[PDB]
Design a protein around this ligand. Structure first.
Ligand SMILES: NC(=O)C1=CN([C@@H]2O[C@H](COP(=O)(O)OP(=O)(O)OC[C@H]3O[C@@H](n4cnc5c(N)ncnc54)[C@H](OP(=O)(O)O)[C@@H]3O)[C@@H](O)[C@H]2O)C=CC1
Ligand SMILES: CC(C)c1ccc(N(C)c2cnc3nc(N)nc(N)c3c2)cc1
Length: 186
């Protein structure tokens, strides 16, 4: 089992969601970036695993779940089995990562991608170990009701560029954004 990563798009006032949808209008190429980063496996014979909370799962249009070409794991303590379409269910992030070293998943999974929401990000970000954050900065303020936790730059180093990630400013629907990669190892 390979690297641990969080991926998120965030507005200037730290928002990541409003009523289970994105705060901004759909950015087609940003969704393509999310799909490409989470799906592309460095190791053949394996898929990457995407981990998400319950509200993030249900925020993906039914036609699109599970996220294709990735193993989909949902976090919940209320649910008693994976939702329709999902592959795995765990009670907690630490349980999910533990499942990842069990018989079944250990030889199937390449990279692990935490794709939201807010409490899952917070926990990952504050847990010791090697972790990267792939952060799309949407360069405007958008009304939101769920936010991405503070990035502690004492621990998370912004990388000066990363392979496969454009470094320059992007714009779609009149909204400028840029892609960043942060790395901690503690
Ligand atoms: N990158 C972006 O811009 C992203 C945006 N989104 C958006 O953000 C918002 C949805 O997210 P948010 O409100 O943060 O909630 P999250 O998806 O975490 O979902 C929370 C639910 O999942 C369960 N859960 C979360 N963490 C854990 C854990 N460690 N263990 C077990 N269960 C857990 C809880 O279910 P239970 O109560 O059953 O225990 C909780 O009700 C939406 O608006 C969506 O559009 C989501 C991801 C990324
Ligand atoms: C239809 C699929 C591709 C879809 C629909 C909604 C969402 N969400 C909540 C979402 C949407 N865009 C996102 N972009 C980045 N950079 N990171 C994320 N974690 C991210 C998450 C994700 C995928």
């Amino acid at each position: 089992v390979g690297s641990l990563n969080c991926i998120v798009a965030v507005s200037q006032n730290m928002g990541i969601g409003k009523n289970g949808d994105l705060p901004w209008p759909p950015l087609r190429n940003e969704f393509r970036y999310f799909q490409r980063m989470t799906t592309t496996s460095s190791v053949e014979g394996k898929q990457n695993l995407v981990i998400m909370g319950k509200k993030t799962w249900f925020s993906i249009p039914e036609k699109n779940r599970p996220l294709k070409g990735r193993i989909n794991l949902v976090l919940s303590r209320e649910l008693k089995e994976p939702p329709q379409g999902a592959h795995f269910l765990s009670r907690s992030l630490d349980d999910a990562l533990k499942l990842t070293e069990q018989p079944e998943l250990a030889n199937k999974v390449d990279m692990v991608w935490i794709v939201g929401g807010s409490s899952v990000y917070k926990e990952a970000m504050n847990h010791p170990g090697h972790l990267k954050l792939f952060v799309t900065r949407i360069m405007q303020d958008f009304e939101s009701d769920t936010f991405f936790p503070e990035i502690d730059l004492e621990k998370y180093k912004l990388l000066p560029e990363y392979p496969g990630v454009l470094s320059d400013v992007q714009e779609e629907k009149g909204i400028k954004y840029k892609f960043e990669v942060y790395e901690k190892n503690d």
